[PDB]
Symmetry: C3
Subunit: 66 residues, 3 copies
């Protein structure tokens, strides 16, 4: 709900996920959300955006055991 | 509404609603939000963006059932 | 907190806060959310963005009244 949308907002503003991947984060399962979040954080690292990586990982942490 | 915010997020990132219309989605009635979402989906369709149209329509459907 | 993410989305759309500040708005307490939202509204007003400014103001008020 709110946590998947947090992930969505941060990942979209980072430009780290494609349209399909964002669609899956919004309409898919929680496991898919966790996996795309991990990919998003790694991509945020790769762009030099350490802050976004830290935010995405904290959100994924909330998303995980849930 | 978390779903109204989903509509807000997707429509803003796609450019499917104008600034005023996004404001209306947040501060307007539920019917106004649904109708602006449908307009956003129709505009995305008109531009050929089927992906955005499919997501917007799913969100609007959730808005209707609530 | 649907309202905290609502505040986050609107404050991010203005470009008034840095990535760190947005991180605090999303992952911090409600008090930090109120203070950074007020900062975002003040900066947006200063940049000429009325609509964003007291949309944020209404949001911060909702956040404060629990
Ligand atoms: Na079409």
């Amino acid at each position: 709900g709110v946590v998947k949308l947090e992930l969505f907002v941060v990942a979209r503003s980072t430009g780290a996920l494609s349209k399909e991947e964002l669609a899956k984060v919004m309409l898919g399962t929680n496991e898919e959300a966790i996996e795309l979040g991990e990919a998003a954080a790694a991509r945020a690292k790769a762009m030099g955006d350490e802050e976004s990586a830290k935010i995405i990982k904290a959100i994924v942490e909330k998303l995980k055991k849930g």
